[PDB]
Design a protein around this ligand. Structure first.
Ligand SMILES: NS(=O)(=O)c1ccc(NS(=O)(=O)CCNC(=O)Nc2ccccc2)cc1
Ligand SMILES: [Zn+2]
Length: 257
């Protein structure tokens, strides 16, 4: 089964998921010399005020926080998107050291981590039908750099000790994802894929220009998680990122000049 190690990592994934070698795979490097401003892009509309978090869990490849997506509580709208996209979950990708961890890169620069806020297109009814559609999902990607502490992340960090190993989960209600956003909503966008199996090409990616700053204290707590379940041999969850994939025939557009 898949992971990020030598024997099951991203170089192996195409054997079970041949779309790994597809025409619109994610992540990509964002070259600011060729990711051109497009004046037709609209401002991004983030409506998370009624977001209802449910649980936080270690699934053996990251930790994710889940939400109640049964109504239009927390939705992503505007930007490059047509229609309305409900927030399903968020999770992160991070490194074995501050110098790497992000999935997207900017002019080949790797950030310490990357946050993925995952949304699905409500015109398809549920997410299982949305993932079969080229416009089924919208993932809001936010880079993390090491600096001052991000107060909106602290509730997450303070609970990670309770989900150290794969399969553990915890109650995680009343978490406000507005606390994970940077100041600016300037973004890049391109059509792409899930960055983990099944790597489906169903994602409109929206990557924010401005990283959020998290403290070294905070990101170190990510690196205490385990890929393995309890009683299994410890394998620390670090470097759980897929490297940049070829942009091929795609365009990346910027909402800003
Ligand atoms: N790293 S990333 O590119 O942002 C990313 C984001 C999400 C995923 N995986 S996912 O499961 O959440 C996809 C959405 N959920 C489903 O399709 N669920 C489903 C499917 C069939 C039946 C019933 C439910 C992987 C990578
Ligand atoms: Zn992700």
């Amino acid at each position: 089964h898949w992971g990020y190690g030598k024997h099951n990592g991203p170089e192996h994934w195409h054997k079970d998921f041949p779309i790994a070698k597809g025409e619109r795979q994610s992540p990509v490097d964002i070259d600011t010399h060729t990711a051109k401003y497009d004046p037709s892009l609209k401002p991004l509309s983030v409506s998370y005020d009624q977001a209802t978090s449910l649980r936080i869990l270690n699934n053996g490849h990251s930790f994710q926080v889940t939400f109640d997506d049964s109504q239009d509580k927390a939705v992503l709208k505007g930007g490059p998107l047509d229609g309305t996209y409900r927030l399903l979950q968020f999770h992160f990708h991070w490194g074995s050291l501050d110098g790497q961890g992000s999935e997207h890169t900017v002019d080949k620069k790797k950030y310490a981590a990357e946050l993925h806020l995952v949304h699905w297109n409500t015109k398809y009814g549920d997410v299982g039908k949305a993932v079969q559609q080229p416009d089924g999902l919208a993932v809001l990607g936010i880079f993390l750099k090491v600096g001052s502490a991000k107060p909106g992340l602290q509730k997450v960090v303070d609970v990670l000790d309770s989900i150290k190993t794969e399969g553990k989960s915890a109650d995680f209600t009343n978490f406000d994802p507005r606390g994970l956003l940077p100041e600016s909503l300037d973004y890049w966008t391109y059509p792409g894929s899930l960055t983990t199996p099944p790597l489906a090409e169903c994602v409109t990616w929206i990557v924010l220009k401005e990283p959020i700053s998290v403290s070294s204290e905070q990101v170190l707590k990510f690196r205490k998680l385990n890929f393995n379940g309890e009683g299994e041999p410890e394998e620390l969850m670090v470097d759980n990122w897929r490297p940049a994939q070829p942009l091929k025939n795609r365009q990346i557009k910027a909402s800003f000049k």
